[PDB]
Design a protein around this ligand. Structure first.
Ligand SMILES: CCCCCCCCCCCCCC(=O)SCCNC(=O)CCNC(=O)[C@H](O)C(C)(C)COP(=O)(O)OP(=O)(O)OC[C@H]1O[C@@H](n2cnc3c(N)ncnc32)[C@H](O)[C@@H]1OP(=O)(O)O
Ligand SMILES: Cc1nn(C)c(C)c1NS(=O)(=O)c1ccc(NCCN2CCN(C)CC2)nc1
Length: 411
């Protein structure tokens, strides 16, 4: 029973999703003119607010709402503490639409109560390869290729309702209003991820974690000491030793990315991403925005052996408030972002990622089993966590695919 999701243009059950063969819209074509010009109705103690994303104070207000009310684990140990600079970066990519950032405020005192954000993404979302092959056996290639062109769509993130306003059906209202503002700009599909199960994922993958500071992670109970370590005289010394890393990167040529790297980086990234069924298409402007280093937010390194860039890796920072332990304020996580390797094995590229993230004081390295992330798990000592990232479309019928056919990283 989903009183809201049952009303929406999404597949309704797993069985429906495993029955789908081609990519395409769920809904009837609609027009910009068809869409209400007036904001969705909301109780008169509240108003809609469109925050200004290049205004430091508005960023601050969104920052605080998320700090106190955004994602926690189920045991209330950690809550995301995305920084202000991270939010400006995430919410203001090139050609972003200010209207797509949707907030609810109390009319009386302008207190922020809820938020949802949309940003533009150019995404390949045509029929996956194996379904195309089948359609070609059967003379249905035309139907299977109809939506192969990259689509300019919306990416949803940062949905948050204040803790005091939970389970008052406010999330559906935020989602309806976001949908309206995006539809008004002639966009009819969206992509979103969630740690929770909703109708209905097109792909789902486990989270993986690479301990960088194991003693801190045990202390805060992000991690436990596995039971075989108890046969050691000093469990923690064995644990520290098991996860230890060099201080200096191993690849010669490794340096930080710079603006003149953009075209080379774009080329090797796009060549690599194009091999997945679902992936973003990036302009020079978007490579520069999503990958150029920004202090405390995104860290990007290239391999340049012979004034020629042949590999790169990137990671981003999300700290979490450590809610139940007084000895630490923040767990500092580094998230594996985009990468491409043409001159060295991927496990060797990513070892340097761990080395850099460790030397910069990160506690853990996190990723989902999308891209070729499975390919270096065992050797680099990542372990699976209890979490899953699920990938969804809005108003797009899509076959169930494996997470290793997904090339879209979500922030
Ligand atoms: C064309 C463009 C279209 C754009 C729109 C695309 C669709 C985008 C969809 C959004 C993608 C966001 C991606 C991310 O940001 S995922 C991260 C979501 N944020 C958090 O988890 C932060 C902490 N939690 C909260 O702030 C609240 O619990 C939220 C706001 C999540 C729910 O508020 P509350 O707990 O006060 O509940 P309600 O009484 O208001 O509403 C209950 C309804 O909400 C459905 N629900 C619960 N969680 C989610 C969820 N994560 N995505 C979609 N729907 C969700 C739920 O099944 C139920 O519907 P139904 O089962 O009765 O049918
Ligand atoms: C360290 C930490 N902080 N927080 C808030 C959590 C849940 C953790 N633990 S964790 O193992 O790193 C982890 C576990 C599960 C998880 N789930 C995905 C939540 N979604 C992340 C991506 N986003 C676009 C939608 C929300 N993300 C992170």
């Amino acid at each position: 029973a989903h009183a809201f999701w049952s009303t929406q243009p999404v597949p309704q059950t797993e069985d429906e999703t495993e029955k789908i063969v081609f990519a395409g819209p769920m809904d009837e074509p609609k027009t910009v003119a068809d869409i209400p010009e007036e904001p969705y109705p909301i109780a008169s103690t509240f108003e809609w607010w469109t925050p200004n994303m290049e205004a430091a104070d508005d960023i601050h207000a969104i920052y605080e709402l998320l700090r106190d009310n955004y994602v926690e684990d189920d045991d209330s140990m950690f809550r995301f503490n995305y920084s202000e600079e991270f939010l400006q970066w995430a919410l203001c990519p090139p050609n972003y639409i200010p209207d797509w950032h949707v907030a609810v405020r109390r009319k009386a005192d302008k207190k922020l109560l809820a938020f949802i954000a949309g940003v533009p993404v150019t995404l390949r979302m045509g029929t996956p390869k194996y379904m195309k092959v089948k359609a070609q056996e059967k003379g249905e290639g035309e139907e299977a290729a109809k939506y192969d062109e990259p689509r300019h769509i919306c990416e949803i993130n940062f949905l948050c309702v204040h803790k005091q306003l939970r389970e008052k059906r406010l999330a559906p209202i935020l989602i309806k209003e976001a949908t309206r503002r995006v539809n008004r700009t002639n966009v009819w599909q969206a992509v979103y991820t969630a740690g929770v199960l909703l109708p209905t994922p097109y792909a789902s993958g486990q989270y993986f974690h690479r301990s960088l500071n194991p003693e801190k992670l045990v202390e805060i109970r992000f991690s436990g000491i596995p039971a075989q370590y108890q046969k050691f005289q000093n469990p923690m010394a064995m644990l520290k030793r098991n996860y230890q890393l060099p201080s200096a990167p191993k690849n010669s040529g490794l340096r930080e990315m710079k603006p003149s790297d953009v075209p080379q980086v774009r080329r090797i990234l796009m060549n690599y991403l194009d091999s997945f069924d679902v992936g973003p298409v990036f302009s020079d402007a978007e490579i520069s925005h999503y990958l150029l280093p920004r202090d405390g937010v995104v860290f990007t390194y290239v391999v340049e052996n012979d004034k020629k860039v042949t590999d790169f890796f990137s990671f981003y920072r999300i700290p979490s408030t450590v809610i139940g332990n007084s000895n630490y304020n923040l767990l500092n996580a580094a998230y594996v972002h985009y990468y491409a390797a043409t001159s060295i094995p991927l496990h060797q590229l990513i070892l340097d990622l761990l080395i850099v993230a460790h030397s910069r004081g990160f506690d853990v390295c996190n990723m989902v089993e999308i891209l070729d992330n499975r390919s270096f798990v065992e050797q680099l000592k990542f372990g699976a966590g209890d979490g899953h990232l699920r990938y969804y479309f809005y108003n797009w019928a899509y076959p169930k695919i494996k997470p290793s056919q997904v090339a879209l990283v979500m922030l």
